[model samples]
Target: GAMGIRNSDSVKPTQQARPTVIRWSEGGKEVFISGSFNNWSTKIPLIKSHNDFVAILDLPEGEHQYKFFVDGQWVHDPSEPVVTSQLGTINNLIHVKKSDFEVFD
Candidate 1:
């Protein structure tokens, strides 16, 4: 099942715009990207880059939080600027920013 953001009612017709990419290294180790997007299940088959061992997730634009499951170990994206977790162990916050890509500068 695909994970998605819900309104206060937990079900509402709403729209949001902001694209995000969640990337991580694989390096001969098994890892998965799980959060509000995949029911936080490492077993699910999310976007994975087997060769690079990096998973990239193009998520909706918003304030989303997630974590990386590496060989049964949960961790945050070390490349991110900020990180925080509840349960004092699991959780990562990511602020998706909107921008345009121009080929020529």
Candidate 2:
């Protein structure tokens, strides 16, 4: 037994994560995606699947802004809904809905 390791009587509610698939179907040789999820600090690379590039990310329930770096150019999918920042920058947006799997009886 460890000292000061008392467990809480009830488990506290935590943010539910949803597996989001970011896909870029346009055209590019090297593709990378970055968003508010990672503070826009890291450029996560996507896998080249046939003619499309995709990356699966675990994201909390809410809207997230992201852009794809294709061939040294930053771009967003116009097919998806986009949000324009105050700085006049546009990025693709996706709203991740909370899952109903967590049922407390």
Candidate 3:
């Protein structure tokens, strides 16, 4: 376990986590984080970080898909790789690993 978050920080350490973060940036009235985890939780609120909105979670190791709800419109994490599901819908995708802490948010 180590701690030192680049200085000006409150980056919660998911030191023992399959940490996941999904984000959306650009002007919007609201932004929500949702994904493949709780598959009623289709709209979990995201925390605003400067100009972007972020969702933080200690997720399980699996193939995860996510999207953002920006002012009621579907959006994706621009920083993440996009993928198409079996339903042929484009979404931001990620893989969580026990040793991976990706905040592609």
Question: lDDT tens string, model 1, 1-105?
Answer: 768866555332445544456666655356666667546754433455554544445456557767766767776655575455556665666677655452344
Candidate 3 local Cα displacement, residue 87, angstroms: 2.1
The TM-score of candidate 3 is 0.66
Shift in Å, residue 51, candidate 2: 4.3
Over 4 Å off, model 3: 1-16, 77-79, 100-105
Determine which window of 10 residues in candidate 2 has minimal summed lDDT. 7-16
Over all chains combined, what TM-score does candidate 2 have?
Answer: 0.74
Quote the lDDT for 84 in model 1: 56
In order, what is each prediction's RMSD in angstroms?
8.6, 9.8, 9.5
For model 3, state the Cα shift of residue 77 in Å: 4.5
Best by lDDT: 2
Please give the clash total of every predicted structure, in order: 2, 0, 1
Could you estimate the TM-score for every candidate?
0.52, 0.74, 0.66
Comparing 2 and 3 on TM-score, the stronger one? 2
Clashes by residue pair, model 1: 18-61, 26-53
Give stretches of model 2 more than 4 Å off.
1-16, 101-105
Candidate maximizing TM-score: 2
